[PDB]
Design a protein around this ligand. Structure first.
Ligand code: HEM
Ligand code: HEM
Ligand code: HEM
Length: 71
């Protein structure tokens, strides 16, 4: 429900929105241009300092391609 699925050509990439809404405070970290869609998203950030960035740093979360890219 509140969750969000991102159709991927290598397996859907589940992303706990509501969950990340309880784990992370400031949303500007994800919604720099205010809450909404992120025109430009993709492997780009999803890989760089997008998701893996706020993951590896703490060493927690889908850091492998078998975690994000894996229906
Ligand atoms: C070295 C491991 C990884 C490889 C080789 C990899 C490869 C790719 C590739 C090739 C794409 C482009 C798909 C396309 O648009 O045709 C992509 C997109 C994406 N990746 Fe990764 N990825 C890896 C790990 C991750 C991880 C760990 C996450 C989640 C934290 C992630 C999240 C995404 C998302 C959300 C997209 C955009 C949706 C899509 O177009 O599939 N990736 N990745
Ligand atoms: C004030 C807190 C937040 C609000 C109000 C919010 C709201 C939204 C809304 C409304 C959408 C989709 C637009 C729509 O359907 O109307 C969205 C998408 C999204 N949100 Fe959040 N969100 C918040 C926190 C977060 C956080 C903390 C992250 C990252 C940890 C995040 C990551 C995303 C991503 C990746 C998308 C998908 C957009 C895309 O496909 O490019 N959100 N958010
Ligand atoms: C669209 C980008 C992102 C995606 C796809 C993503 C995906 C995920 C997923 C699938 C988990 C597994 C946790 C679970 O639900 O059990 C996770 C965990 C986590 N993510 Fe993210 N994430 C993203 C962005 C971020 C950002 C920006 C931050 C920091 C601002 C962040 C911080 C964390 C932390 C700290 C955890 C560990 C869970 C815990 O608190 O135990 N993530 N992430």
């Amino acid at each position: 429900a509140d969750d969000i699925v991102f159709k991927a050509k290598n397996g859907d990439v589940k992303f706990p929105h509501k969950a990340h809404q309880k784990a992370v405070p400031d949303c500007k970290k994800c919604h720099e241009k205010g809450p909404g869609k992120i025109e430009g998203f993709g492997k780009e950030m999803a890989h760089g300092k997008g998701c893996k960035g706020c993951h590896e740093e703490m060493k927690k979360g889908p850091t492998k391609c078998g975690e994000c890219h894996k229906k």
